[PDB]
Amino acid sequence: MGSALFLVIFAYLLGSITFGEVIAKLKGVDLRNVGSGNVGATNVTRALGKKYGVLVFFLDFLKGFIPALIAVKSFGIDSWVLTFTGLASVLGHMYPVFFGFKGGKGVATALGVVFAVSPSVALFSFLVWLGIFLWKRYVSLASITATISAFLFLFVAGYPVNVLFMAIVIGALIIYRHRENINRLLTGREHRFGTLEVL
Ligand SMILES: CCCCCCC/C=C/CCCCCC(=O)OC[C@@H](O)CO
Ligand SMILES: CCCCCCC/C=C\CCCCCC(=O)OC[C@@H](O)CO
Ligand SMILES: CCCCCCC/C=C\CCCCCC(=O)OC[C@@H](O)CO
Ligand SMILES: CCCCCCC/C=C\CCCCCC(=O)OC[C@@H](O)CO
Ligand SMILES: CCCCCCC/C=C\CCCCCC(=O)OC[C@@H](O)CO
Ligand SMILES: CCCCCCC/C=C\CCCCCC(=O)OC[C@@H](O)CO
Ligand SMILES: CCCCCCC/C=C\CCCCCC(=O)OC[C@@H](O)CO
Ligand SMILES: CCCCCCC/C=C\CCCCCC(=O)OC[C@@H](O)CO
Ligand SMILES: CCCCCCC/C=C\CCCCCC(=O)OC[C@@H](O)CO
Ligand SMILES: CCCCCCC/C=C\CCCCCC(=O)OC[C@@H](O)CO
Ligand SMILES: CCCCCCC/C=C\CCCCCC(=O)OC[C@@H](O)CO
Ligand SMILES: CCCCCCC/C=C\CCCCCC(=O)OC[C@@H](O)CO
Ligand SMILES: CCCCCCC/C=C\CCCCCC(=O)OC[C@@H](O)CO
Ligand SMILES: CCCCCCC/C=C\CCCCCC(=O)OC[C@@H](O)CO
Ligand SMILES: CCCCCCC/C=C\CCCCCC(=O)OC[C@@H](O)CO
């Protein structure tokens, strides 16, 4: 259907709005040259402050939630339209047409996709993330662990193959976007998150 193609294209274009760069540019800051140089909510928190980072997280989450919600309600949980809508949102966040195809790691937007599929699974995956983050204070370790957990939760809950395909590809892409963090974690060179007073 034409409406299926338009929903997927809409999801990619919406995901291509790198809200970390939007907010930082509104503030005259080049997010690629402050902090870690990454463009997600974590680096916004690191460079501009937790309140700006919460805003960016919410906006990047909504990019994934809104199109996936439309897909679920219009085409059904079993539809491969949902599969490609969720993938398009995440791929837009990672490879944004509006920001030189240099985007983020995909965690916030992927959580938004999952929330449209299953708010409970999204909550459980967030709880894993927060637990792992508070355990060791590595953002990357929390995101990798929670991404794997999210797939396992959808699998054991019995979600259909279109959803599992969407989740395994999104999850693999997220882990790939963390490949440098994994290298640092394996060699003891990953930094814990926070100011010197917090740490
Ligand atoms: C840009 C500033 C304004 C805020 C943006 C709007 C945020 C929320 C939008 C509502 C979500 C989209 C509607 C989803 C929905 O219920 O779709 C179900 C529909 O497909 C039933 O067939
Ligand atoms: C790079 C993609 C974005 C720019 C181009 C967007 C539009 C491109 C091609 C038009 C495809 C229209 C397909 C409509 C279609 O098959 O509708 C049939 C359906 O509505 C009922 O069977
Ligand atoms: C990077 C992603 C690119 C996506 C490109 C999507 C467009 C692909 C194929 C176009 C299909 C032709 C549809 C033309 C059309 O409106 O025909 C009407 C006809 O199908 C109804 O009888
Ligand atoms: C169809 C719904 C779309 C919802 C999102 C709407 C788009 C919102 C933000 C993206 C563009 C923000 C650009 C703001 C702006 O002009 O900032 C200028 C300033 O950053 C200096 O370059
Ligand atoms: C299997 C595919 C779906 C994966 C869903 C996403 C991973 C699940 C849970 C983590 C969500 C909480 C993220 C908390 C947070 O502050 O993230 C900041 C963000 O910038 C990290 O890159
Ligand atoms: C449409 C419904 C929206 C539901 C909520 C969407 C936003 C989800 C999560 C935002 C929380 C991210 C921050 C997580 C967090 O507390 O990180 C740990 C750290 O802050 C502890 O110091
Ligand atoms: C204008 C701003 C919001 C843009 C949202 C774009 C959403 C794209 C398409 C809307 C969904 C159309 C669904 C058509 C429909 O009834 O499909 C039913 C489907 O199950 C086939 O029988
Ligand atoms: C619905 C349309 C939304 C459009 C949102 C605005 C996107 C367009 C222009 C904003 C600036 C894009 C370039 C940002 C960028 O990556 O700058 C280059 C970077 O290497 C700076 O270090
Ligand atoms: C699949 C549908 C595609 C529809 C057309 C999308 C492309 C339209 C306009 C491009 C927006 C601004 C792109 C410029 C851009 O990303 O520049 C930033 C880059 O130089 C950062 O190094
Ligand atoms: C539903 C699947 C749609 C596929 C869309 C894929 C995402 C959007 C554009 C593809 C870019 C492919 C090339 C990779 C790329 O962006 O290079 C990385 C960038 O950092 C260098 O400019
Ligand atoms: C489906 C997504 C749901 C996520 C939205 C809810 C986020 C709300 C709260 C998370 C943060 C909890 C408080 C963390 C905190 O106070 O940590 C203190 C800790 O650093 C002490 O060592
Ligand atoms: C397995 C999924 C659940 C999430 C991971 C569970 C790991 C267990 C506990 C995490 C709670 C946060 C505090 C852990 C801890 O020892 O923090 C030390 C810190 O508070 C003081 O240096
Ligand atoms: C805090 C720790 C939480 C850990 C949750 C553990 C979930 C992981 C593995 C359990 C495997 C259960 C057996 C396989 C299973 O349910 O298959 C899924 C599917 O075939 C059911 O439709
Ligand atoms: C069974 C299917 C397996 C599919 C292959 C796994 C894809 C995941 C990660 C890609 C790892 C290699 C990176 C590719 C690469 O150099 O891309 C860089 C840039 O030009 C485009 O992103
Ligand atoms: C949900 C099932 C479990 C998934 C666990 C995924 C863990 C992924 C990558 C971790 C690789 C590094 C292992 C060592 C590590 O984290 O060390 C932390 C610190 O002590 C030194 O960097």
Numbering used by the authors: 0 to 198
What text does the study give?
In bacteria, two distinct G3P acyltransferases (GPATs), PlsB and PlsY, catalyse the committed step. PlsY acylates G3P using acylP, forming lysoPA and inorganic phosphate (Pi). The overall shape of aaPlsY resembles a funnel composed of three tilted helices (α1–3) sitting in a cup composed of seven TMHs.
By contrast, rod-shaped aaPlsY crystals were obtained in LCP made of 7.8 monoacylglycerol (MAG), a powerful host lipid for several crystallization projects. The striking shortness of TMH4 (n = 11) is compensated by the membrane-embedded Loop3. Thus, the collective poses of the MAG molecules near the gate are reminiscent of the snapshots for the exchange of acylP and lysoPA between the active site and the membrane. Despite the different states, the five structures are superimposable with root-mean-square deviation values within 0.52 Å, suggesting a lack of flexibility.
